[PDB]
């Protein structure tokens, strides 16, 4: 009659690393490192994202003609932009503080699109039909759907001075442009003046733009430029535009609703009818593990990103069988 004390063994090939010995074969272990993803852009807690397609943030927010599919979207969990978009500023120019505007839109959960200066009620003494072949649509010249290129009307460009009060109880994003023609002939030919000015003033924003006429390289068959500008209007503030020429007037504006957890990501993964709590540019993550090596850019409730290839924690014993 005998009794013995011993310990478990099995055919487990699970290996972990220890401080005294690498590659220790153990009986039971748990992997703490998530490396799998579905390779698709999914909904975040049911709410779908905003796919920009071939449109950039500038093209989406300025109303590029090839981005009309994006106007109907006014709520999303996050924003997907292709790594290098195709349809951005169709008329060349400099977008002032573009990255800051991207950062502002990264914390937006929804907005309300409304025409702040309706195209057929605001400038009775100005022409509102200016288009360009550089911003073409369906083969014909066109222009941004959120801006209005004021040109000459009956041979005169009167002094315009409009304003808007914030009747929306939220922040209102306003965008406009300033035209810079290539030569003096097109300048006088378009605005009937030689020394024009644009003036935008709010309670705490104040800037004055002067057109700079010079010979510039061709960009999309255009020698003139249009510098783009934007501002945030607090609830209750009034914005004042005064111009006598070279003003790309605002047409539509956006009443912003803030929200956390959203952001702008660059991804080529396709959208799918999937739902997840964690989204990365590589794909959605469906896991409850504390670590992941899929991607450092995360949206939602994700595991903490690490550069590790293996994080296996032993629960059982050193497997010493037969």
């Amino acid at each position: 009659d005998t009794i013995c004390i011993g310990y478990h063994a099995n055919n487990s090939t699970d290996t972990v690393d220890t401080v005294l010995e690498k590659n220790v074969t153990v009986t039971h272990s748990v992997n703490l490192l998530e490396d799998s993803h579905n390779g698709k852009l999914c909904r975040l807690k049911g709410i779908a994202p905003l796919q920009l397609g071939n449109c950039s943030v500038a093209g989406w927010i300025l109303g590029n003609p090839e981005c009309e599919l994006l106007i109907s979207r006014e709520s999303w969990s996050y924003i997907v932009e292709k790594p290098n978009p195709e349809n951005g500023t169709c008329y060349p120019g400099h977008f002032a503080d573009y990255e800051e505007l991207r950062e502002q839109l990264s914390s937006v959960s929804s907005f309300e699109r409304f025409e702040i200066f309706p195209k057929e009620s605001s400038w009775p003494n100005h022409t509102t039909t200016g288009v360009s072949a550089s911003c073409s649509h369906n083969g014909e010249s066109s222009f941004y759907k959120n801006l209005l290129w004021l040109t000459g009307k009956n041979g005169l460009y009167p002094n315009l001075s409009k304003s808007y009060a914030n009747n929306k109880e939220k922040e209102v994003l306003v965008l406009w442009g300033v035209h810079h023609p290539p030569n003096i002939g097109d300048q006088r030919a378009l605005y009937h003046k030689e020394n024009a000015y644009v003036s935008v003033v709010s309670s705490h924003y104040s800037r004055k733009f002067t057109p700079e006429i010079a010979k510039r390289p061709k960009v999309r068959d255009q020698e003139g430029r249009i510098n783009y500008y934007w501002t945030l209007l607090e609830p209750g503030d009034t914005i004042i535009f005064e111009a006598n020429g070279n003003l790309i007037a605002p047409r539509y504006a956006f009443a912003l609703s803030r929200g956390f957890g959203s952001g702008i990501i660059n991804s080529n993964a396709p959208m799918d009818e999937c739902d997840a709590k964690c989204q990365t540019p590589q794909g959605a993550i469906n896991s409850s593990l504390p670590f992941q090596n899929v991607h450092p850019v995360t949206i939602g409730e994700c595991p903490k990103y690490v550069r590790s290839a293996k994080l296996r924690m032993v629960t059982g014993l050193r497997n010493i069988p037969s």
Binding site: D1, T2, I3, I5, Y7, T18, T298
Partner: protein, 171 residues
Amino acid sequence: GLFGAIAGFIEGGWTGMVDGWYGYHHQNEQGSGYAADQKSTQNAINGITNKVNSVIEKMNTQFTAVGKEFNKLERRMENLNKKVDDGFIDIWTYNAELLVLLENERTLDFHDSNVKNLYEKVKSQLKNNAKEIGNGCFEFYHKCNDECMESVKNGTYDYPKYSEESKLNRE
């Protein structure tokens, strides 16, 4: 092992025991068999469960954090943003890998301690009514049916009930 039990005076493991980590192996007139000690195994399961749980709990949920854009005149700020992101990633990588290493070692040491302590319990029960053959087994100096074996397992062995028999057999 730190406590000399696992891969120590007990040389190998038992594939025939499939219901627990630390257990027994009895062979009497009624037959032999393996059986896992449920108290020690359950204590190990509770402790290791709480350890992994603590590791996961100290890793709070990573919420939304995306990259940022910088224009051509913001290279210093772009490189600072990268330095921050890369630095935090490096620190969290180091923390995870080092933690897993050290606590893996301490987990194996924990099992070794559980086996050593179980052996010392059974030894403290049997006393001189059995001799300590190697490999962590006890050779009984008296008769031990399934009643007596199960008395040793649940830690209720009766020492005086066999002292006469064992003292006679020890000659």
